[PDB]
Amino acid sequence: MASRILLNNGAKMPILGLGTWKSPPGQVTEAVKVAIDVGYRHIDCAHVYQNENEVGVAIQEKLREQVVKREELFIVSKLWCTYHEKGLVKGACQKTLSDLKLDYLDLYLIHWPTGFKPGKEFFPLDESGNVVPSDTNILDTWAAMEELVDEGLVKAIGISNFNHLQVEMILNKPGLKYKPAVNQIECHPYLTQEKLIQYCQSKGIVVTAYSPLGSPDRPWAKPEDPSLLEDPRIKAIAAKHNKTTAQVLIRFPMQRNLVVIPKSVTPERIAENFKVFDFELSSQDMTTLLSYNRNWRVCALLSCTSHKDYPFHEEF
Ligand SMILES: NC(=O)c1ccc[n+]([C@@H]2O[C@H](COP(=O)([O-])OP(=O)(O)OC[C@H]3O[C@@H](n4cnc5c(N)ncnc54)[C@H](OP(=O)(O)O)[C@@H]3O)[C@@H](O)[C@H]2O)c1
Numbered sequence: 001m002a003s004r005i006l007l008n009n010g011a012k013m014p015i016l017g018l019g020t021w022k023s024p025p026g027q028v029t030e031a032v033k034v035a036i037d038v039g040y041r042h043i044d045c046a047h048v049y050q051n052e053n054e055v056g057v058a059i060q061e062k063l064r065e066q067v068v069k070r071e072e073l074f075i076v077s078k079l080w081c082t083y084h085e086k087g088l089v090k091g092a093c094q095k096t097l098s099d100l101k102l103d104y105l106d107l108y109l110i111h112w113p114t115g116f117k118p119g120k121e122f123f124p125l126d127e128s129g130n131v132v133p134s135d136t137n138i139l140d141t142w143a144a145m146e147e148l149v150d151e152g153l154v155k156a157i158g159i160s161n162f163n164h165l166q167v168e169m170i171l172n173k174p175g176l177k178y179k180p181a182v183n184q185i186e187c188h189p190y191l192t193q194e195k196l197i198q199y200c201q202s203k204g205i206v207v208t209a210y211s212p213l214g215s216p217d218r219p220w221a222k223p224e225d226p227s228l229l230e231d232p233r234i235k236a237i238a239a240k241h242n243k244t245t246a247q248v249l250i251r252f253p254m255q256r257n258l259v260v261i262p263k264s265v266t267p268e269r270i271a272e273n274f275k276v277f278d279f280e281l282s283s284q285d286m287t288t289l290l291s292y293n294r295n296w297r298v299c300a301l302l303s304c305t306s307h308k309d310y311p312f313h314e315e316f
């Protein structure tokens with residue numbers, strides 16, 4: 001299968017990337033170095049993950065070592081919710097660039113459609129405990145993102161956790177200069193997202209699937225939540241193809257024409273997770289995995305359910 005998908009900005013994005021949420025700062029430099037050594041060319045980052053400096057140390061080393069050229073890498077980061085104000089977006093991008101040791105990003109995403117009050121706290125909640133919003137409109141945030149393209153700091157802009165109509169708001173924004181290239185959303189067999197994927201693909205927007213393994217290291221997991229890596233039905237499909245459960249869970253979105261970004265800091269698993277271009281799931285396998293949908297989310301942003309722009313009220 002082809003390793004890179006064409007974006008609506010004319011650049012090609014690797015369909016397999018390395019995730020870095022929850023990767024410890026003491027382990028993520030080695031994790032990104034090993035990932036680049038074994039073939040990965042896309043790294044998914046975010047300022048709110050608090051490890052971009054350490055990701056940058058790895059990228060910089062592999063670039064200086066001439067293990068890879070900058071043009072061959074596809075580096076993604078995300079604008080955090082406390083920087084939606086027009087006057088804060090460039091600084092937020094520039095801090096990410098400085099941390100990552102880069103002079104441009106390949107793709108910069110609005111991390112959530114929800115803007116929060118600016119300040120040192122990433123989740124600034126009022127005496128009572130609810131997120132304090134910003135009044136900045138997300139069409140104005142989008143215009144600020146478009147300026148980053150026109151200034152050369154980013155080659156592509158996109159969105160993340162946007163529901164279908166929020167996508168629609170962006171796409172219908174008066175004066176729209178650049179369409180979003182990507183919508184990065186949670187997607188796996190327990191949250192299959194057919195409606196939202198269809199809408200986005202129909203518009204030339206590429207979808208990236210996050211938490212493709214079900215995020216077993218998510219901070220709020222409970223023993224009684226479903227577990228994709230332990231699902232006997234998924235292990236059965238993996239056994240049939242002589243692959244691991246993780247490899248099936250990574251190959252599944254690839255065959256829906258999605259980009260996928262599994263996280264690991266374990267060198268053996270980083271390597272294993274990339275070995276997904278040598279087998280094919282059947283259509284029957286694909287439909288069977290889709291049938292496991294239960295609308296179950298890893299990331300529901302539970303402190304923001306009353307924000308004007310909370311995304312997960314809408315069906316899709
Ligand atoms: N846009 C957003 O709002 C958003 C939200 C969530 C996630 N994301 C992105 O998506 C990435 C992936 O999602 P995620 O971090 O939630 O979870 P994930 O990729 O679904 O799962 C990560 C977990 O799976 C384990 N693991 C990886 N490979 C494995 C294998 N081959 N066998 C067994 N276990 C394996 C990892 O363990 P070890 O690391 O210990 O090996 C880790 O505990 C993130 O890191 C982030 O980059 C973005």
Ligand SMILES: NC(=O)[C@H]1C[C@]2(NC(=O)NC2=O)c2cc(F)ccc2O1
Nearest residue numbers: 021046048049111298299300301302
């Ligand atoms: N479940 C949620 O709603 C998650 C999302 C998230 N995970 C992720 O990758 N991007 C994100 O917003 C995350 C990351 C953080 F550093 C802090 C909070 C948090 O809430």
